């Protein structure tokens, strides 16, 4: 799929209305394609895990669609072990656990009996990824950023969009939830992302992985051919680039539009 | 300078007089431009010692002048052509006043300008060219045109033999002017540019305060509260030079811009005194073709002329000797 | 004399920039001032070559009214003109008409306008009331008078 | 006028002299309620700070860091802050402070500047060029020392490459000094990168350990955290004050803001460089800071040759409100004897003070603006502000068959003045 | 400016943008002169349709 | 390539101001020169007409 217009946020924490201010910050380029990494997560027999490692090329635009709580968290850090601090995030049931403490190996939910989702709709026996370490950086538990709107008779798709970026060590999370019905991946339109979380932790972040709990399989197909295809997707990952984006706000203050300055000569 | 250069800070203002009279010159230079604009309107319009009124009855020998004569029905005593001109010239504003930037209103109001324009129209229509050489003299319009045809190379018998046809031509031609400005979006390009350049020049001047000019931050109050006194000025004076030079560049740019306007302002006064106040024998000075007579029209930050010209057509070639 | 050479330049160069840029402004201000004079200088030459060296048909170019002559006068940093102009006065208003019909044919004034003092019709020049008896050499015929 | 014009006899006409500016009534300082003392004062009480190979970052949380309390404990040695002034560290608000525990050789305590690139910089810790922060230190030689030598001050002598600023890792490797695989332990052509100072308490200050607290901070968009116990004050919604909102020094009229900040948005800006809107640290109120009402002043005078009465013009002000209602010492220009003046005449360019508008029009001498002129004559000589007369009204009886022909003339000789050449100049 | 003032150096160019719009004005001012030269030839010569 | 970064701008900004002011002086000098040409260009247009 192609990131047509999504991947735009509020660059600075300053209000302005009816202004055409320019910005030098990091942004996801317009009209750039992003990877799917569609994972079946069958939880059957021996091993069903299809969440590979991502290079984290100077920040990640992470989009995802689910029903209630398919996505769980993210993992950062290079060594992926207790040797270096891992920026592990857990989207709790009614909380968030954003911890940096080292872990030997993140745990996983039990690969249960072959009778996986016959009638076992209960919710327990989670991953419990937090491996105890004597050396820990303090966590930043706060309000959960996963708010879900109940849509009925279909025609609802609460897409969750996030941007994770590292600049001068400071690590920032921008987030948005958009409850619009999409007929295709990365639907048209415009939605600016608000700044949510800051992090004053400085360490190398050259690797990336996604946490997803799908012990109860809910409409997850698979494929075995790389290329530019179409179909249902669990999430999308794009890499941010140094750009020179220009922004247009509203009278109310919402960022109504943005234009690239290195994509099209007309845009220039 | 006390407002634009320094944020009404007694620490910065002391460094401003430390630079001498770079600001007395700029205030004086802009003051010369301000009095110049009020002077420029004087030569263009204030060419008549008296103010004339058209008679209540307005049968101008079949010629129709309703488009250029003022209509008393409107509270703004302006012609329909002038009304269209005023609507098509679109003149933020409040943010400039808070940074020491001011706009002074012109000495002559737009309503007072339309009174000179009406006075000039009344003199040309009823009195002809005589009201620019001395006392205005009564002369009927059908015979005014006959001595304007005599001024281009056609005998006066041509007009009377085609008086009704010529009036229909003039009435139809002047009615096309109102639609011509509406159709063309760039009709008032020269006037719209004058107000555009001024707005952009002030907008650039206000936006120049963001230039940190080698200092910590653009906000002057930031340094005074964050940085200690005995070393802050080496950042203030670094910031004041870029701020002052940016202000000096704007003043210089206005001087060339005002000089170009003075070239146009004198040209308008030159055209007013010959195309309107009389009949000009110069070719392509008062419009394309043999010029007959002209009409002044008030406009925002300028003047609009309606040159009435004589253009031959429907020719046949003969054998001469 | 007061401050040592190795560090005086950082105060001299600070002083030389303001001193030089002050001189730069004066040079620039003279250029616009000289350009404005050039517009006046060429205008004076244009007026000299037309108002003085001849008679100008341009209205309100060589003084108020119909221009006759001009006299240049030397002045400090400029020139002074003495425009001699013709200004009408003591006007009277008469009854007029565009043409005269005598034998069914229209008669038009070769020069001047037809003027009647109340009883007899006269044709006279435009800028001076010099009535004349309407004879056939003072007018021309173009078609019937209908 | 005769001061700015620099003479004693001013000519008839208008002259711009200065501006009219009101002055703030009171001072307002608004800070977040929280003022919990800051726990970084306990760092001063500590004895052992760190060994410089995995330096930590003691982030000071949301509290109040009465810096004078730290200055009341013991004298400081370096105190060299190449950033914010380390004197008025009270009335400005810090988003976050990142002082780190540190100690280094006393020969290198004076090398805390980010220019001494070497063992201290390329291998221990590097400070970026575009950095703001302070450095403080005090005596730590006698408190912690060893007669044989302080081996606890071991640090990273050598590493793989240049140590980038704001990077924290342990160089657990052996330097390759020759053709030798350094994955295995060796002593020849493969040396372990490490150095220990071995300090002793019986030598000069050039070889005595000094504990160094590198204060690192930055002024951010984030809400203020650590800016002292300073008294919060009241709030005004109609009067100009000298506000100090979260360390944002400024002045102007503070009023309620109808602009819709987003639930997170904090600072408001116009299409300009000044902070237009602001969010109150307490009661989450949104304010609409605007500069106090002001305008330029020009004086209309008929010249000292004729009289002495003058009329001042306050440009671009609805003067029924601002200059008429001026309290004691409301303006710094003062001359407040004209608070009401002789008469007031509102004009589109601001009202006139000291002149009476008459209903009879005249050809005018001193222009003001918007078709209004001023002159000095009788109503017993005063300054009037009549609307300028466009000229004597006239009408000519246009008729179908009426001609007007002059019967006489007048050879009038006018004059015309034209500059030709300006005086030549040449500089050197 | 990016070429005359700075020798295509990313260190100098960062300082140049830090001065604001002294360089958008010069580019615009010279652009206005360039249009004038093409216009000046129009009135002198392009008088016949 | 010779002088260190954290105070190279101390000499770069001193050099950029004189370099920029010279460029600004050329831009201004062209404006008067273009204005004089415009006065002559209109004169040629008048003579042609
Ligand atoms: C800014 O947001 C407000 C609401 O927060 C909008 O105001 C509403 O606009 C709709 C548009 O038709 C009206 O039906 C409502 O009655 C308005 N409500 C209120 C309380 O004003 C406003 O239109 C928005 N501004 C825009 C879109 O420019
Ligand atoms: C002069 O021209 C105007 C055109 O503006 C004439 O006004 C028109 O009059 C007719 C007949 O009453 C109306 O049908 C049109 O709508 C008018 N045009 C308008 C209002 O724009 C005016 O009548 C003409 N003068 C004379 C004496 O006929
Ligand atoms: C002939 O001229 C005389 C004066 O020169 C006219 O008499 C006055 O003219 C002025 C002109 O503005 C009018 O305001 C007065 O009302 C006139 N007074 C009288 C008593 O008429 C006279 O009207 C003119 N007559 C003609 C036929 O042109
Ligand atoms: C001047 O001539 C006109 C026509 O040649 C005379 O008739 C007037 O014509 C206008 C326009 O058609 C009408 O509005 C008027 O109502 C007409 N007047 C009359 C009395 O019918 C006009 O009367 C002549 N002027 C004088 C003073 O007689
Ligand atoms: C035309 O004007 C001239 C002067 O403007 C008049 O000459 C004056 O005539 C009176 C009558 O005796 C003398 O008292 C004056 O001394 C004369 N003036 C001069 C300057 O000599 C002349 O009378 C006027 N003629 C008409 C017909 O109006
Ligand atoms: C994205 O596009 C690039 C170049 O257009 C291509 O090499 C890459 O395979 C694409 N990846 C996906 C997942 O579409
Ligand atoms: C387990 O489920 C996955 C998808 O949910 C499916 O691909 C796999 O075939 C299943 N296991 C078996 C043994 O069928
Ligand atoms: C998640 O929530 C459960 C109960 O809702 C709680 O016991 C647990 O501590 C939470 N985890 C985190 C990391 O906050
Ligand atoms: C388990 O599956 C059976 C299938 O017959 C169903 O009847 C029963 O309701 C299921 N249990 C639950 C708790 O839903
Ligand atoms: C954890 O703490 C102790 C401190 O010596 C030790 O086991 C180890 O060095 C630490 N782990 C790190 C720094 O990764
Ligand atoms: C008009 O002039 C003639 C010239 O002979 C004269 O006889 C006649 O009396 C004049 N009319 C009047 C009303 O004086
Ligand atoms: C981060 O990685 C870079 C290169 O991969 C390295 O030069 C640097 O020392 C690393 N920083 C830390 C703290 O490990
Ligand atoms: C701070 O004090 C003000 C005083 O009115 C109060 O309104 C506000 O709720 C307080 N905030 C907190 C976080 O206690
Ligand atoms: C007043 O002006 C006149 C001429 O304008 C002059 O002769 C006289 O000396 C002046 N008086 C004073 C006191 O300056
Ligand atoms: C000026 O102030 C008066 C109060 O006397 C008020 O009625 C009027 O609306 C104000 N006008 C403007 C333009 O501010
Ligand atoms: C001006 O108005 C006053 C009072 O309304 C009146 O007495 C006077 O006659 C008027 N003057 C003029 C010239 O209208």
DSSP secondary structure, D328-354, as one string: TT-BSS--GGGSS-S-EE--TT--EES
The rounded distance, in Å, linking the Cα atoms of D417 and D355 is 35
Structure tokens at B32: 């010369």
Q: Which helix (H) or strand (E) holds A2?
A: strand A2-3
| Among B208, B212, B253, beta carbon nearest to E21 | B208
| Among D169, D269, D271, beta carbon nearest to A14 | D269
Tell me, rounded to whole angstroms, the distance of Cα D400 from its chain centroid: 74
The rounded distance, in Å, linking the Cα atoms of C103 and D314 is 77
How does DSSP classify residue D382? E
Regarding chains C and E, contact by 3 or more CB pairs under 8 A is answered as no
The rounded distance, in Å, linking the Cα atoms of D329 and D341 is 17
CB within 8 Å: F9 and E15: yes
CB within 8 Å: E45 and F48: yes
Decide: D417 and C78 in contact? Cβ < 8 Å: yes
Tell me, rounded to whole angstroms, the distance of Cα B83 from its chain centroid: 15
Q: CA geometry: angle at D7 spanning D2 and D11, to 5°?
A: 70
Mutation test of the interface with chain B: which of D132, D390, D399, D407, choosing the one with the most B Cβ atoms within 10 A? D390
- DSSP-assigned beta bridge partners for residue A26: A242
Q: Residue F35: its chain C contacts at CB < 8 A? A: 35
The rounded distance, in Å, linking the Cα atoms of D67 and D41 is 9
Neighbours of chain B (3+ CB pairs under 8 A): C, D, E, F
Residue A177, helix vs strand vs coil: strand
Decide: A99 and A121 in contact? Cβ < 8 Å: no
The rounded distance, in Å, linking the Cα atoms of B294 and D20 is 48
Q: Residue E43: its chain F contacts at CB < 8 A? A: 41-42, 45
Decide: D103 and D52 in contact? Cβ < 8 Å: yes
How does DSSP classify residue B63? B
The rounded distance, in Å, linking the Cα atoms of D204 and B245 is 54
The rounded distance, in Å, linking the Cα atoms of D416 and B269 is 16
B246 touches E: beta carbon within 8 Å: yes
Decide: B253 and B204 in contact? Cβ < 8 Å: no
The rounded distance, in Å, linking the Cα atoms of C3 and C1 is 6
Kindly list the residues of chain D whose beta carbon comes within 8 Å of any beta carbon in chain F.
Answer: 114-115, 129
Query: For chain F, how far is it from start to end, CA to CA, in angstroms?
Result: 62
In chain C, residues preceding a discontinuity (C to N beyond 2.5 A) are none
Protein residue whose Cα sits closest to atom 9 of ligand 10: A135
CB within 8 Å: E43 and F38: no
Identify how many contiguous H helices and E strands chain D contains and give both numbers.
2, 24
Decide: D358 and D384 in contact? Cβ < 8 Å: yes
The rounded distance, in Å, linking the Cα atoms of D215 and C128 is 99
Phi, psi at residue B249, to the nearest 5°?
A: -65, -40
The total of other beta-carbon atoms located within 10 Å of residue A154's CB is 7
CA-B59 nearest atom, ligand 2: 27
Structure tokens at E31: 């652009």
Nearest Cα to A263, choosing from A31, A17, A21?
A31
The residue of chain F nearest to residue C21, with distances taken between CA atoms, is F21
Residue with tokens 């525990």: D101
Query: For chain C, how far is it from start to end, CA to CA, in angstroms?
Result: 105
| Among E5, E29, E47, beta carbon nearest to F27 | E29
Phi, psi at residue B2, to the nearest 5°?
A: -60, -25
Least distant ligand from the CA of B63: 2
Nearest Cα to A97, choosing from A106, A87, A105?
A87
Nearest Cα to A236, choosing from A12, A86, A32?
A32
Nearest Cα to A103, choosing from A131, A75, A128, A140?
A131
> Experimental technique used?
cryo-EM
Q: Residue D169: its chain A contacts at CB < 8 A? A: 84
Å from C8 to nearest chain D CA? 23
Decide: D291 and B98 in contact? Cβ < 8 Å: yes
Structure tokens at A252: 């109310």
Structure tokens at E46: 């392009």
User: CB-based contacts of D230: which residues, under 8 Å, 6+ apart?
Assistant: D29, D31, D90, D91
Strand order in the sheet with A209-212: A96-99, A88-91, A71-75, A209-212
In terms of DSSP bridges, do strands D267-269 and A14-16 run parallel, antiparallel, or are they unpaired? parallel
Residue A226, helix vs strand vs coil: coil
Residue B29, helix vs strand vs coil: helix
Resolution (A): 3.5
The rounded distance, in Å, linking the Cα atoms of A173 and A196 is 6
F39 touches E: beta carbon within 8 Å: no
Decide: B258 and B36 in contact? Cβ < 8 Å: yes
Nearest Cα to B7, choosing from B226, B222, B214?
B222
Tell me, rounded to whole angstroms, the distance of Cα B3 from its chain centroid: 30
CA-A228 nearest atom, ligand 6: 14
The rounded distance, in Å, linking the Cα atoms of B172 and B169 is 5
Residue with tokens 């009406």: B118
Torsion of CA B23, B29, B30, B35, to 10 degrees: 140
Q: CA geometry: angle at A265 spanning A262 and A266, to 5°?
A: 115
User: Does any ligand 4 atom lie closer than 6 A to the CB of residue D414?
Assistant: no
| Among E19, E29, E47, beta carbon nearest to B211 | E19
Top mutation candidate among D33, D34, D232, D280 for ligand 13, by most atoms within 8 Å of CB: D33
Residue C88, helix vs strand vs coil: strand
Give the 3-state DSSP-derived string for D3-14, with helices as H, strands as E and coil as C.
CCCCCCCCCCEE
The rounded distance, in Å, linking the Cα atoms of B140 and B127 is 8
Identify how many contiguous H helices and E strands chain F contains and give both numbers.
1, 0
Length, in residues, of chain E = 49
The rounded distance, in Å, linking the Cα atoms of D148 and D169 is 29
How many whole angstroms from B114 Cα to the centroid of ligand 16? 24
Beta strand spans in D76-230 (E): 96-97, 100-104, 133-139, 175-176, 190-191, 210-218
Decide: D256 and D288 in contact? Cβ < 8 Å: yes
The residue of chain B nearest to residue D368, with distances taken between CA atoms, is B107
């Amino acid at each position: 799929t192609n990131s047509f217009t999504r991947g735009v946020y509020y660059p600075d924490k300053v209000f302005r209305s009816s202004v055409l201010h320019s910005t030098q910050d990091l942004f996801l380029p317009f009209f750039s394609n992003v990877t799917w990494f569609h994972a079946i997560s069958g939880t059957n027999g021996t091993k069903r895990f299809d969440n590979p490692v991502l290079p984290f090329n100077d920040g990640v635009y992470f989009a995802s669609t689910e029903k209630s709580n398919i996505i769980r968290g993210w993992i950062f850090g290079t060594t992926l072990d207790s040797k270096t601090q891992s920026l592990l995030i857990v989207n709790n049931a009614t909380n968030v656990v954003i911890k940096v403490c080292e872990f030997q190996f993140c745990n996983d939910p039990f690969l249960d009996v072959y009778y996986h989702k016959n009638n076992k709709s209960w919710m327990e026996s989670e991953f419990r990824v937090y491996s105890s370490a004597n050396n820990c950086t303090f966590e930043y538990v706060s309000q959960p950023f996963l708010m879900d709107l109940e849509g009925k008779q279909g025609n609802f798709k609460n897409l969750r969009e996030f941007v994770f970026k590292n600049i001068d060590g400071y690590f920032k999370i921008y987030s948005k939830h958009t409850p619009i019905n999409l007929g295709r991946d990365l639907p048209q339109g415009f939605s600016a992302l608000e700044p949510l979380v800051d992090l004053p932790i400085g360490i190398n972040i050259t690797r990336f992985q996604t946490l997803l709990a799908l012990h109860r399989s809910y409409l997850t197909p698979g494929d075995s051919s790389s290329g530019w295809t179409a179909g249902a997707a669990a999430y999308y990952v794009g890499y941010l680039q140094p750009r020179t984006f220009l922004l247009k706000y509203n009278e109310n203050g919402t960022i109504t539009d943005a234009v690239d300055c290195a994509l099209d000569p007309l845009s220039e | 300078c006390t407002m634009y250069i320094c944020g009404d800070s007694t620490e910065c203002s002391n460094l401003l007089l430390q630079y001498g009279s770079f600001c007395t010159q700029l205030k004086r230079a802009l003051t010369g431009i301000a009095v110049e604009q009020d002077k420029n309107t004087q030569e263009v319009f204030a060419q008549v010692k008296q103010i004339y009124k058209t008679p209540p009855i307005k049968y101008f020998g079949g010629f129709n002048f309703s488009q250029i004569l003022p209509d008393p029905s409107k509270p703004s005593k302006r012609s329909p052509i002038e009304d269209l001109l005023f609507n098509k010239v679109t003149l933020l504003i409040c943010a400039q006043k808070f940074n020491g930037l001011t706009v002074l209103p012109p000495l002559l109001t737009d309503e007072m300008i339309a009174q000179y324009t009406s006075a000039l129209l009344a003199g040309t229509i009823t009195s002809g060219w005589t009201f620019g050489a001395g006392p205005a003299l009564q002369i009927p319009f059908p015979m005014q045109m006959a001595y304007r045809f005599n001024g281009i190379g056609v005998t006066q018998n041509v007009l009377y033999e085609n008086q009704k046809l010529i009036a229909n031509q003039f009435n139809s031609a002047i009615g096309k002017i109102q639609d011509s400005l509406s159709s063309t979006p760039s009709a008032l390009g020269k006037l719209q540019d004058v107000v555009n350049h001024n707005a952009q020049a002030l907008n650039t001047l206000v936006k120049q305060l963001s230039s940190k000019f080698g200092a910590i931050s653009s906000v002057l109050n930031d340094i005074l509260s964050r940085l200690d006194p005995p070393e802050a000025e080496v950042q203030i004076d670094r910031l004041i030079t870029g701020r002052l030079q940016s202000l000096q560049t704007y003043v210089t740019q206005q001087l060339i811009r005002a000089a170009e306007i003075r070239a146009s302002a004198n040209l308008a006064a030159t055209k007013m005194s010959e195309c309107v106040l009389g009949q000009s024998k110069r070719v392509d000075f008062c419009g394309k073709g043999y010029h007959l007579m002209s009409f002044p029209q008030s406009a925002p930050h300028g003047v609009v002329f309606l040159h009435v010209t004589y253009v031959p057509a429907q020719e046949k070639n003969f054998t001469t000797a | 004399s007061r401050l040592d050479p190795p560090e005086a330049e950082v105060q001299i160069d600070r002083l030389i920039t303001g001193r030089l840029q002050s001189l730069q402004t004066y040079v620039t201000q003279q250029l616009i001032r000289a350009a404005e004079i050039r517009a006046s200088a060429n205008l004076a030459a244009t007026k000299m070559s037309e108002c003085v060296l001849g008679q100008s048909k341009r209205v309100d170019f060589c003084g108020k009214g119909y221009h006759l002559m001009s006299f240049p006068q030397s002045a400090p940093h400029g020139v002074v003109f003495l425009h001699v102009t013709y200004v009408p006065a003591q006007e009277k208003n008469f009854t007029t008409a565009p043409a005269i019909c005598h034998d069914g044919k229209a008669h038009f004034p070769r020069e001047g306008v037809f003027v009647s003092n109340g009883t007899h019709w006269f044709v006279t020049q435009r800028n001076f009331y010099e009535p004349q008896i309407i004879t056939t050499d003072n007018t021309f015929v173009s078609g019937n008078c209908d | 006028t005769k001061c700015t014009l620099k003479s004693f006899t001013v000519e008839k006409g208008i002259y711009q002299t200065s501006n009219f500016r009101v002055q703030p009534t009171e001072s307002i300082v608004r800070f977040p309620n929280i003022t919990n003392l800051c726990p970084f004062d306990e760092v001063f009480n500590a004895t052992r700070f760190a060994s410089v190979y995995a330096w930590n970052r003691k982030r000071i949380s949301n509290c109040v860091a009465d810096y004078s309390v730290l200055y009341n404990f013991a004298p400081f040695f370096a105190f060299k802050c190449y950033g914010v002034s380390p004197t008025k560290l009270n009335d400005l608000c810090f988003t976050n402070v990142y002082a780190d525990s540190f100690v280094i050789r006393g020969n290198e305590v004076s090398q805390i500047a980010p220019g001494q690139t070497g063992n201290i910089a390329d291998y221990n810790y590097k400070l970026p060029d575009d950095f703001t922060g302070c450095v403080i230190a005090w005596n730590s030689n006698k408190l912690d020392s060893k007669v044989g030598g302080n081996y606890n001050y071991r640090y990273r002598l050598f590493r793989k490459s240049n140590l980038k600023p704001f990077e924290r890792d342990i160089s657990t490797e052996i330097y390759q000094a020759g053709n030798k695989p350094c994955n295995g332990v060796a002593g020849v052509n493969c040396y372990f990168p490490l150095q220990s100072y071995g300090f002793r308490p019986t030598y000069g200050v050039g070889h005595q350990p000094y504990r160094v607290v590198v204060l690192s901070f930055e002024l951010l968009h984030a809400p203020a955290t650590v800016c002292g116990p300073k008294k919060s004050t009241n709030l005004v919604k109609n009067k100009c004050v000298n506000f100090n909102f979260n360390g944002l020094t400024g002045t102007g009229v503070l009023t309620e803001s109808n602009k819709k900040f987003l639930p997170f948005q904090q600072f408001g800006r116009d299409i300009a460089d000044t902070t237009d809107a602001v969010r109150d640290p307490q009661t989450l109120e949104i304010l609409d800071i605007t500069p106090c009402s002001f305008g330029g002043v020009s004086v209309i005078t008929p010249g000292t040759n004729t009289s002495n009465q003058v009329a001042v013009l306050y440009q671009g002000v609805n003067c029924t409100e601002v200059p008429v209602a001026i309290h004691a010492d409301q303006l710094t220009p003062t001359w407040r004897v004209y608070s009401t003046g002789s008469n007031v005449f509102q004009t589109r360019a601001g009202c006139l003070i000291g002149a009476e508008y008459v209903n009879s029009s005249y050809e005018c001498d001193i222009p003001i603006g918007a078709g209004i002129c001023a002159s000095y004559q009788t109503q017993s000589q005063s300054i009037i502000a009549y609307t300028m007369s466009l000229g004597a009204e006239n009408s000519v009886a246009y008729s179908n068959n009426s001609i007007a022909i002059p019967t006489n003339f007048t050879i009038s000789v006018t004059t015309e003045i034209l500059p030709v050449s300006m005086t030549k100049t040449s500089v050197d």
